Amino acid sequence: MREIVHIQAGQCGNQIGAKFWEVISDEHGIDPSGNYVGDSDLQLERISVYYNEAHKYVPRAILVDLEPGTMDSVRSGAFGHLFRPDNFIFGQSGAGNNWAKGHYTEGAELVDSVLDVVRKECENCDCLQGFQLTHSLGGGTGSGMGTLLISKVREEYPDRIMNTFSVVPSPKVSDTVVEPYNATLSIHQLVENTDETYCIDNEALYDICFRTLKLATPTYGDLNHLVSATMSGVTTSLRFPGQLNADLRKLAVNMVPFPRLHFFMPGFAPLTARGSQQYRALTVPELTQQMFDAKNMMAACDPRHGRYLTVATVFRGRMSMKEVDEQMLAIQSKNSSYFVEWIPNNVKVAVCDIPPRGLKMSSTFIGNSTAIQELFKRISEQFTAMFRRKAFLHWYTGEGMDEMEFTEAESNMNDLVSEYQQYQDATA
Amino acid sequence: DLGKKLLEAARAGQDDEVRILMANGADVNATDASGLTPLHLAATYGHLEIVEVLLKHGADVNAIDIMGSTPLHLAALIGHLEIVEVLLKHGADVNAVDTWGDTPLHLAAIMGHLEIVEVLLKHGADVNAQDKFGKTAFDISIDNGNEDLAEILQK
Amino acid sequence: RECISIHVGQAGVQIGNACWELYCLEHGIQPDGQMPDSFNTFFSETGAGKHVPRAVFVDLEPTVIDEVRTGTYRQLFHPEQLITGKEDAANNYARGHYTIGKEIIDLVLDRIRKLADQCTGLQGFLVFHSFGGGTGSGFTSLLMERLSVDYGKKSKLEFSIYPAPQVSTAVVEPYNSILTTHTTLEHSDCAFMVDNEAIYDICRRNLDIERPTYTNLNRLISQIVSSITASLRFDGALNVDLTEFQTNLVPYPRIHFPLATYAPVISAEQLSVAEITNACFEPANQMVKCDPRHGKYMACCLLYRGDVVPKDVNAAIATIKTKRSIQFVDWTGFKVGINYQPPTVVPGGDLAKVQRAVCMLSNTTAIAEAWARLDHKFDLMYAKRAFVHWYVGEGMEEGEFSEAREDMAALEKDYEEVG
Ligand SMILES: Nc1nc2c(ncn2[C@@H]2O[C@H](COP(=O)(O)OP(=O)(O)OP(=O)(O)O)[C@@H](O)[C@H]2O)c(=O)[nH]1
Ligand SMILES: Nc1nc2c(ncn2[C@@H]2O[C@H](COP(=O)(O)OP(=O)(O)OP(=O)(O)O)[C@@H](O)[C@H]2O)c(=O)[nH]1
Ligand SMILES: [Mg+2]
Ligand SMILES: [Mg+2]
C-alpha cells in the first residue's frame, strides 16, 4: 500500500488541489523545484505515497479541465511548474455547468486521454493504494466528467480504493440554480462508485467564514484556506508513519460499516482566518470539544441531530497522549447517547507530533455521522423544487441524457437519506 | 402557427422576433402542451424586456400552467429579482399556490434567493402558507438550518 | 527435541523480537548468534559456532519485519525465515485467510519445511499472533490449517494477543477474534491468551508507566512466555515436551486456554516462596482479566524459577489449599516445576531483577468470561451486519460469521458443563 494517484478536475477541483499540493509540500520539505529542504526524516519516510522520485520529488498528480485556461492558472501558482507537464489534460471550452456535457459529450470525448495518463502513472507504482479525486459537484466538468472518470477508473482498477474530496454547492456561494441537478446526478455516481468521500460543504465553509471568522465577503481563497487545512489533517495518517488508518483501505475498514454510507463529515480545530495571528494555542480540552462542535464541521449539519457510527480524530502537536486519552474518553462518556451502542469502541484517536504550519496545536475530526442526511436533504429539496417544474431539463436531455436519470438520481439520494435515518433510529 | 413561434421566441430571448410575431397577430396568451405561456417562459429564462413587452400587450400575469405554476412562481424559483419586481408591479398574486402547495415565497426560500424573499414579504407574502406537507417557508428555513433565511422570514 | 516458533503479523513479530532477545540473554547468546546442550531445542548450531533461532517471522506488509532485518538482531535469524508480502490484510480476517494470505502461504510452508528438515525429532510449533489484526487472525488460521495437514502428528501451541480498547486501532477486532478462534480451535492443542488490557494495567500499576508502549507490554509478555517455555529450553522435569502441555493443562480438548498468572512484577526502583505463591491467586497478576473464584479449576501447574527450595514450595502449596477456596473439578492437584536459574531481565527494561519468580498456569472455567466479552461485542455489530461487506468481498461467505459464532456459543456451553 504505497502510491496514491491524485486527480483534480474542473476549476474547484484544480484550485483546492493546487492548495493541497502547496500545503503538503511544505509539511514534507519539498520546494517548488522539487528538491527536499527539510530538517526531519519523518518528512521523507512516506514521501512515496504522494510523490514520484526521479533527487527531485514530483507530485503524482493529474490535472484535468474542459476549460483550457485552468492549465494556465495552475501553472502560474507556486508549485505549478513542478507538476509533470504531460499530466495536464485539457479541452477546448468548458461545460457551462452542464453535467451532461461533462459526463456524456465533451467530457466523454476527453476522458480516454486522461485514462492514458492515469494508466501511465499506475504502471510506475510499486504498490498502488488507489485514487484521490478533488472536484466540485455543482459544476459541469468536475461533477459530470469527474464521475465518468471515477467509473472508468473503477472498472479498470476494481481492487484499489477510490477516495474523493467533493465540494457540495450552496446558493450562499454560487447562485447558479442548476447546481442541485449536477450535485444530485453526481451523488448518485459517488454512492455506487467511491469507497470514501469527504463532504466539503460550501454552505458550511461560507458560514464559518462569515459568522465565526467575521469575514465580510468570503472569497474562494477564504473558503479554500479551510479546505486545505482539512485536507492536510485528514491525510496526515497516510503521509507519516503511524498505527491508525495508515492507508486508504484500513481507513475505509474503520470508517465504513455499510458500503453506501461512506460520506464523511471533516471537522477541524482551531478554525483560523488567513493572515490572522493565532495566539494562545488551544488546550487539549479545547481541541477535543471544538472538534465535535457543529460550528467546526466542514459539512453543514449538526452532529447532535444524528448519531456517530464511527469517528477518527487526529491530534497534531506536542501534548500529552495521556490527557488526549482522558479528554477523548470523557467526551464519549458524557455524550454516549450520540454514539451508536451497536458499534463498540467506535472512536479511534491518533496523536502525531508534527503540527501543521502556523499552529502548534491542531486536531482533525473525521466522522461517519447519520446527521450527514441533513446535507443530502438540503440538496434533495432544491433538486425537487427545480425538477418538479422541469426547469432547464432540455439543456441536459439535448446532450444525450434521459429524464429518467434525473428520477433515478433523486430516488437513490432519497434512499441514502432513509438509510441514514434507519441506522440513526436503530437500537442495540 | 404564430403561437408556437412566440412561445419559442419568448423562451430564447429573441426580442425582435417577439415583436415581429406579435405584429403579425401572435397570441400573447398562447400555451404550450403543459400550459406554459410566453410570459411564463420569459420569466423562467430571465428575459426581462420580453416580460415587460408581453405585460404591456395583454399577457395574463397570473396565468397558471397544468401544475398551477404562475410566472411569479417561476421567477421566484429561478431567482430573477427584476422580473419578480415587474410581475408584482403588474398585479401578480404574491400568494398564488401551485399543485404542490408551494407559494412563490416557498420557492425563493428553498433556493436561497434571499433578496427575492424580502421583496415577496414586503408585498404581503403569507408566512403562514403551508405546502402539501404542512411546511411554511419558515418551517423550511428551520428544518434546513438556514439561519440567514430564518431571520429574514421574521423581519 | 526441536520446537519451531512462528511469529505472524505485527503483534506476533514484535513479541517474537522481545522473546528471542530475552532467550539470547538467558542462554548467553550474543545478537550475532555467537556464544563463548539444553537450548538446542530452540537454537540450531551452525558450526562457525553460530546458534540460530528455529524461528520464522511472517507479515503481509514489510514494515515491521524490515526493522528486524536492520536492527540489533539483524544477524541472529536465518534471513530467509524473515518473510514479507507487500499489502497487508487491512484489519480484515478474510484478506489474511483468503485473498492476500493465499499469495504467500506456499512460500511460508516451504520455508518452515527447511527448518523442519534440520530437526531430528521435531516436537511441533509455538505460534505467536494477535486476535485483532487481519494477518494475526486470518493468516494464522490458514497457516494452522496447512500445518495440521502437513504435520499431522505434531503439537501446536499458541500465544495469542486478546484485544483491548486502549491500544486498539480497528473497530472490527471482535469479528477477527471470533473468526480466527473458530477456525484455529481444532488445530491448536493449547493456547495461552494474553489480554492486552491486563498487561497494560500491570505496566501502569506495578511498573509505574503512565502510558505503556508496545515494548513495555512486550517485555512483560516475553518474561511470561519465557517462564512457560523454559522447561523446553533447560531440560526441566515438568512440561519437558510439547505433548506434556496438553497432558497437564488440557484435560478437555476444546477448553484448551489456560490462564497465566505471574509474580513478582517489580519496577526497576525480596519475596519468599510463600509470598510469590500467594501472589499467584491475586487477580491483578493475571494475564487475562476474569475471576477464578467464580469458576472451577481443571488443572494447575506452578513453574518456579530462581532460588527456590522444593520443601518451601511444598509448604506454601499446603498452606494455600488449607486457606484459600481453590475448587478443582471432581474429575485436583498442583504440578510443580523448578528451574534453579535466576530470572533474567533485559538491559533497557522496566523490571527489577528478582531472586525468585513463579508463573502459574491454571485451566479455569473463569476464562469463559473473556470469551463472553468478545462474543457480546461481536453480537452487537453482527446483528446490524456492520462491516460485514468488507469480509464478504474478500473471499468469504456470510454464513461463516454465524458458524464461527455458534462455535463460540458451544465453547461457552462447554465451560458451563464442566462447572
Ligand atoms: N470551495 C470552493 N468552491 C469552488 C471553488 N471554485 C468553484 N467552486 C464551486 O464549484 C461549483 C462550480 O463548479 P466549477 O469547479 O467551477 O465547474 P467546473 O468543474 O470547472 O465545470 P464547468 O466549468 O461547468 O465546465 C460552484 O458550487 C462553486 O461555488 C473553489 O475554489 N473553492
Ligand atoms: N501486545 C502487543 N500487541 C500488539 C502489538 N502490535 C499490535 N498489537 C495488538 O494487535 C492487534 C492488531 O494489530 P496487528 O494486529 O498484529 O495486525 P496484523 O497481524 O499485522 O494484521 P494487518 O496489519 O491487519 O495485516 C491490536 O489488538 C493491537 O493492540 C505488539 O507489539 N504487542
Ligand atoms: Mg470550469
Ligand atoms: Mg500489520
Side-chain angles (χ1 to χ4, degrees), chain A residues 1-91 93-277 281-428, chain B residues 1-18 20-132 134-150 153-155, chain C residues 2-152 154-209 212-268 271-321 324-419:
Chain A
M1 284 301 259
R2 180 192 314 277
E3 294 87 353
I4 296 180
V5 168
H6 171 97
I7 303 166
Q8 42 188 67
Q11 167 183 311
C12 180
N14 274 279
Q15 305 267 17
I16 69 173
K19 284 280 157 233
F20 169 80
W21 286 104
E22 294 172 13
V23 172
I24 72 159
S25 289
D26 162 71
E27 300 188 10
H28 290 284
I30 306 304
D31 80 1
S33 88
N35 302 123
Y36 170 76
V37 285
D39 49 320
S40 170
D41 259 346
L42 278 149
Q43 278 179 144
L44 283 169
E45 194 148 324
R46 294 185 97 195
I47 196 60
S48 65
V49 174
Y50 280 107
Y51 300 80
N52 286 326
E53 206 191 328
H55 168 69
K56 264 220 62 181
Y57 299 90
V58 186
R60 201 174 294 107
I62 299 175
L63 305 89
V64 183
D65 199 343
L66 285 175
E67 171 63 66
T70 303
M71 63 198 319
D72 301 298
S73 61
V74 173
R75 265 194 298 268
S76 77
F79 283 73
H81 294 274
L82 187 57
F83 299 110
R84 185 200 277 253
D86 295 353
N87 284 15
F88 292 66
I89 298 87
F90 291 90
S93 163
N97 302 305
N98 189 317
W99 192 94
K101 289 188 181 170
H103 200 82
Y104 286 118
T105 54
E106 325 188 327
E109 292 175 22
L110 189 59
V111 70
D112 286 316
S113 49
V114 180
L115 295 155
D116 291 332
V117 181
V118 181
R119 198 162 300 119
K120 184 237 60 184
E121 283 287 0
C122 290
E123 315 266 357
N124 240 7
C125 298
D126 180 69
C127 181
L128 177 73
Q129 299 200 48
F131 303 87
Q132 166 180 298
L133 168 90
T134 57
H135 62 152
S136 67
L137 301 183
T141 296
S143 69
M145 188 182 181
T147 53
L148 177 63
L149 273 158
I150 291 172
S151 289
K152 295 290 186 60
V153 166
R154 252 283 205 258
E155 59 176 356
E156 180 171 11
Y157 305 90
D159 295 13
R160 324 270 173 195
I161 301 297
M162 171 66 79
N163 174 53
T164 66
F165 293 82
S166 305
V167 179
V168 178
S170 163
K172 306 191 162 173
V173 170
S174 169
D175 205 37
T176 314
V177 293
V178 295
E179 304 204 21
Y181 289 157
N182 300 333
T184 296
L185 299 166
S186 292
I187 283 163
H188 186 104
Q189 300 284 308
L190 299 178
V191 169
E192 299 315 344
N193 290 326
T194 79
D195 298 291
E196 34 205 7
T197 290
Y198 291 97
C199 295
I200 305 302
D201 192 358
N202 273 351
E203 177 99 21
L205 307 173
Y206 178 92
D207 288 337
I208 290 172
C209 300
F210 179 85
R211 295 185 169 257
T212 301
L213 300 181
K214 294 313 194 306
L215 300 172
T217 65
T219 66
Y220 284 124
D222 298 324
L223 313 182
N224 288 347
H225 179 71
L226 300 171
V227 176
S228 69
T230 294
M231 290 185 78
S232 159
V234 306
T235 61
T236 288
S237 75
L238 311 174
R239 290 185 291 113
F240 297 95
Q243 285 291 298
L244 165 69
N245 296 333
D247 59 68
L248 293 173
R249 185 163 326 267
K250 282 191 160 175
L251 178 69
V253 169
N254 274 340
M255 290 306 299
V256 185
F258 303 109
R260 295 159 49 89
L261 309 195
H262 63 257
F263 301 90
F264 307 149
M265 175 170 331
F268 190 75
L271 303 157
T272 75
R274 215 164 184 117
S276 96
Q277 205 50 71
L282 273 45
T283 56
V284 185
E286 224 145 45
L287 290 172
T288 306
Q289 174 99 340
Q290 208 157 311
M291 252 194 305
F292 292 76
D293 190 329
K295 312 184 130 23
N296 294 57
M297 301 295 97
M298 300 303 155
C301 315
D302 189 343
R304 281 176 84 235
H305 288 184
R307 291 209 267 167
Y308 300 104
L309 311 171
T310 56
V311 175
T313 69
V314 187
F315 296 74
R316 293 185 71 188
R318 222 92 48 102
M319 65 193 85
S320 38
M321 192 185 38
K322 175 192 292 112
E323 180 195 9
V324 164
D325 283 347
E326 270 162 34
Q327 290 299 328
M328 288 300 307
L329 176 162
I331 199 162
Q332 300 169 253
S333 320
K334 45 191 279 224
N335 304 311
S336 58
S337 291
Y338 295 93
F339 294 90
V340 301
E341 56 267 60
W342 42 270
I343 297 179
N345 310 110
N346 59 350
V347 178
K348 304 308 189 199
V349 176
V351 176
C352 292
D353 211 293
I354 296 173
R357 191 164 104 151
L359 279 35
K360 304 205 139 51
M361 306 273 279
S362 81
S363 61
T364 303
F365 162 96
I366 309 174
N368 200 344
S369 177
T370 69
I372 196 81
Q373 73 170 303
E374 299 183 322
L375 175 158
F376 293 116
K377 284 190 192 140
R378 186 188 90 223
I379 301 303
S380 182
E381 184 159 46
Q382 292 169 344
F383 174 98
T384 293
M386 290 285 291
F387 185 62
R388 295 221 271 214
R389 285 85 190 169
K390 310 286 182 261
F392 309 143
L393 290 203
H394 291 326
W395 192 54
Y396 290 79
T397 58
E399 303 287 315
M401 290 190 79
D402 188 350
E403 162 172 326
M404 200 85 199
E405 317 183 33
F406 278 74
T407 303
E408 301 175 289
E410 179 189 42
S411 61
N412 197 17
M413 198 165 63
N414 292 338
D415 286 346
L416 194 65
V417 164
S418 302
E419 293 164 39
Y420 285 117
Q421 185 65 40
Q422 156 190 357
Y423 294 115
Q424 179 168 302
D425 292 335
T427 176
Chain B
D1 178 55
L2 294 189
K4 198 41 138 274
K5 292 187 179 83
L6 179 64
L7 284 148
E8 192 39 66
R11 179 206 276 99
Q14 293 172 147
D15 305 66
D16 295 335
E17 216 210 344
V18 174
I20 296 154
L21 285 167
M22 296 170 63
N24 277 96
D27 180 1
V28 161
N29 289 301
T31 52
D32 74 5
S34 77
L36 295 164
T37 65
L39 184 57
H40 282 100
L41 293 183
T44 299
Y45 287 75
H47 297 127
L48 171 68
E49 296 73 10
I50 284 166
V51 165
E52 286 168 323
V53 168
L54 288 168
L55 283 166
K56 197 50 204 59
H57 300 93
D60 183 357
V61 72
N62 288 321
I64 49 156
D65 74 2
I66 179 154
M67 304 309 271
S69 299
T70 59
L72 182 60
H73 279 103
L74 306 177
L77 170 76
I78 305 305
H80 293 306
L81 171 62
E82 300 180 283
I83 288 169
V84 161
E85 301 262 25
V86 176
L87 286 174
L88 288 164
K89 166 185 187 129
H90 283 79
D93 180 359
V94 70
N95 286 325
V97 186
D98 62 25
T99 186
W100 299 281
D102 282 327
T103 63
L105 182 69
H106 285 96
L107 302 184
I110 291 164
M111 299 302 294
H113 304 313
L114 306 187
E115 72 291 300
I116 288 177
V117 166
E118 299 195 285
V119 172
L120 295 173
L121 289 174
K122 288 316 92 200
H123 282 80
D126 183 0
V127 304
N128 291 155
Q130 289 182 281
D131 73 7
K132 292 287 179 93
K135 304 289 174 244
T136 73
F138 190 59
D139 289 305
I140 286 160
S141 80
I142 296 310
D143 296 356
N144 69 16
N146 190 340
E147 292 183 87
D148 300 322
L149 171 61
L153 290 165
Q154 320 166 258
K155 60 82 178 146
Chain C
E2 303 92 342
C3 307
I4 289 166
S5 305
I6 305 168
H7 312 271
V8 176
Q10 178 179 105
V13 166
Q14 294 188 151
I15 287 162
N17 293 342
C19 292
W20 289 94
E21 146 180 83
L22 184 56
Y23 293 166
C24 283
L25 300 179
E26 290 186 3
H27 292 298
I29 298 158
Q30 279 147 19
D32 46 22
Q34 300 278 157
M35 177 169 86
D37 213 321
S38 65
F39 56 76
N40 289 348
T41 54
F42 274 48
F43 297 75
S44 60
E45 202 167 338
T46 296
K50 198 171 172 290
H51 301 90
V52 184
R54 309 183 193 272
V56 193
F57 290 66
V58 184
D59 201 1
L60 297 177
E61 164 209 33
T63 286
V64 180
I65 286 175
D66 278 347
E67 280 169 59
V68 183
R69 297 166 164 143
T70 61
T72 309
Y73 303 96
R74 88 188 79 115
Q75 289 181 294
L76 184 67
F77 303 105
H78 286 305
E80 77 274 27
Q81 301 298 346
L82 310 178
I83 302 178
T84 52
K86 294 153 106 57
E87 239 177 61
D88 61 26
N91 285 316
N92 185 335
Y93 171 92
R95 283 174 56 99
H97 187 266
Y98 299 103
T99 53
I100 302 290
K102 71 179 63 160
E103 308 179 343
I104 213 169
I105 184 62
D106 283 341
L107 179 54
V108 167
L109 285 159
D110 286 349
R111 287 277 174 69
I112 285 165
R113 180 56 75 185
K114 187 179 192 186
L115 293 181
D117 287 346
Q118 300 348 298
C119 294
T120 75
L122 172 69
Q123 306 185 49
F125 308 92
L126 303 203
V127 182
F128 296 76
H129 69 107
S130 56
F131 274 169
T135 298
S137 69
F139 185 85
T140 298
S141 279
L142 179 62
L143 179 65
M144 300 278 279
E145 290 162 341
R146 298 287 297 266
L147 288 181
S148 282
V149 173
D150 293 354
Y151 303 82
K154 306 286 194 261
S155 299
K156 305 200 284 309
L157 272 62
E158 301 166 78
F159 290 85
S160 293
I161 304 306
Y162 177 102
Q166 293 79 350
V167 287
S168 154
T169 69
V171 191
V172 287
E173 289 185 14
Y175 283 170
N176 297 334
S177 298
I178 296 332
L179 292 168
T180 191
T181 299
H182 165 48
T183 48
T184 296
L185 199 62
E186 71 186 287
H187 301 300
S188 183
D189 297 304
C190 184
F192 298 106
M193 287 186 288
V194 179
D195 181 348
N196 264 349
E197 185 174 309
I199 310 295
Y200 195 87
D201 283 351
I202 290 167
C203 283
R204 317 189 75 245
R205 308 170 180 172
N206 282 204
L207 300 180
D208 295 316
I209 304 181
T213 70
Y214 314 123
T215 296
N216 298 126
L217 299 193
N218 288 171
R219 281 195 173 117
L220 176 54
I221 293 173
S222 71
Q223 291 277 172
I224 291 139
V225 175
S226 176
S227 72
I228 291 180
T229 66
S231 63
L232 303 169
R233 298 180 283 121
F234 294 93
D235 195 47
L238 174 66
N239 294 339
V240 64
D241 280 326
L242 283 182
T243 58
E244 216 189 316
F245 283 83
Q246 329 169 198
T247 308
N248 291 333
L249 293 169
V250 179
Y252 268 142
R254 285 164 56 71
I255 304 297
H256 61 52
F257 300 94
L259 181 65
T261 308
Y262 183 85
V265 167
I266 296 170
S267 161
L271 272 56
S272 77
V273 170
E275 284 154 348
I276 61 174
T277 301
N278 290 339
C280 287
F281 296 83
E282 299 280 341
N285 301 323
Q286 300 172 3
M287 290 218 314
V288 175
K289 305 197 55 173
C290 63
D291 198 341
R293 318 232 188 155
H294 295 354
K296 309 165 123 203
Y297 289 103
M298 293 163 279
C300 296
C301 298
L302 293 160
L303 300 167
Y304 293 86
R305 84 194 298 187
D307 172 20
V308 171
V309 190
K311 254 52 71 203
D312 296 334
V313 176
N314 289 332
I317 286 185
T319 67
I320 69 194
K321 318 200 292 214
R324 291 312 342 124
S325 100
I326 46 176
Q327 206 272 5
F328 287 95
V329 310
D330 312 309
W331 49 272
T332 306
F334 280 97
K335 294 186 151 101
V336 173
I338 300 174
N339 181 307
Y340 294 95
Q341 285 285 309
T344 304
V345 304
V346 158
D350 318 285
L351 273 169
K353 324 219 198 257
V354 304
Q355 263 187 248
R356 52 194 67 93
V358 55
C359 184
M360 191 172 72
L361 302 177
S362 53
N363 199 339
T364 167
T365 66
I367 205 155
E369 295 167 4
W371 292 123
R373 295 192 306 266
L374 271 183
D375 289 345
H376 172 64
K377 297 190 193 268
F378 183 104
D379 289 344
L380 291 168
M381 285 188 299
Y382 188 62
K384 270 64 179 174
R385 303 293 188 276
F387 303 90
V388 170
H389 69 288
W390 288 115
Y391 296 73
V392 164
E394 284 290 12
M396 178 171 147
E397 305 241 42
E398 179 151 330
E400 190 171 342
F401 282 87
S402 50
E403 297 168 18
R405 182 57 178 95
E406 294 166 24
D407 194 16
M408 301 300 301
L411 182 70
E412 288 201 45
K413 183 153 103 44
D414 289 328
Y415 280 115
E416 290 175 359
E417 293 165 341
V418 293

